[PDB]
Amino acid sequence: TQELASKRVDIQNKRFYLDVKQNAKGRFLKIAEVGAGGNKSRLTLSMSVAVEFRDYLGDFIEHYAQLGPSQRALKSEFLVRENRKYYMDLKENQRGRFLRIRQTVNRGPGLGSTQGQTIALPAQGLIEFRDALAKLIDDYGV
């Protein structure tokens, strides 16, 4: 398994890596939320699914940009493809708005296991994260 490319996105004090990889089966994207001394969690997406993810990020962006001042998710979506489900929830807590992304298996073994498969993006970073993703899709295609 070869690494084609790796981008890092720094959002407040969190860091995320988007890496494009290749194997015999084809091209894929790995998205890691980094912890203190390792990756906390990672998502795995095909390059095709990454395109759809990019588009959903667009919708989240638009939603966030329109909320106005803050005074149960603000917005919840999910995408299934290839026996993989991705839940996308825009939420707020005390520290601010964020976009949680959880990956699971649709069916077969795992059947709703989510461990080291949840990332949480501070919402401030959604544009930069979408742009990095979009750059990698422009670079490496499919």
Residue numbers in the entry: 58 to 128, 141 to 211
Describing publication, verbatim:
Mutations in the human PURA gene cause the neurodevelopmental PURA syndrome. Based on the crystal structures of PURA from Drosophila melanogaster (dmPURA), three conserved sequence regions termed PUR repeats I, II, and III were identified to fold into globular domains. Whereas PUR repeat I and II assemble into an N-terminal PUR domain via intramolecular interactions, two C-terminal PUR repeats III from different molecules interact with each other and thus mediate dimerization of PURA. All these PUR domains belong to the class of the PC4-like protein family, which mainly bind single-stranded nucleic acids and can unwind double-stranded DNA and RNA.
For a better understanding of the structural impact of genetic variations in the N-terminal PUR domain (hsPURA I–II), we determined its structure (fragments E57–E212) by X-ray crystallography. The N-terminal PUR domain resembles the previously published PURA structure from D. melanogaster (dmPURA I–II WT) with an average r.m.s.d. of 1.2 Å. However, in contrast to this invertebrate structure, we observed for hsPURA I–II that the four molecules within its asymmetric unit of the crystal lattice showed marked differences in its loop regions and in particular at the edges of the β-sheets. This suggested greater structural flexibility than average domain folds and most likely than its D. melanogaster ortholog. Already the different molecules of wild-type hsPURA I–II in the crystal unit cell revealed considerable conformational freedom, not only for narrow movements of the loops but also in the folding of the β-strands. For instance, in some of the molecules in the asymmetric unit of the wild-type hsPURA I–II crystal, β4 and β8 strands formed bulges. From all the areas of the structure, the β-ridge appears to be structurally the most divergent part. Determination of the crystal structure of hsPURA I–II revealed larger flexible regions than the previously reported invertebrate structures, with considerable differences in the four molecules of hsPURA I–II in the asymmetric unit of the crystals. These observations provide clear evidence that in particular strands β4 and β8 of the N-terminal PUR domain are dynamic and can adopt considerable local differences within the β-sheet.
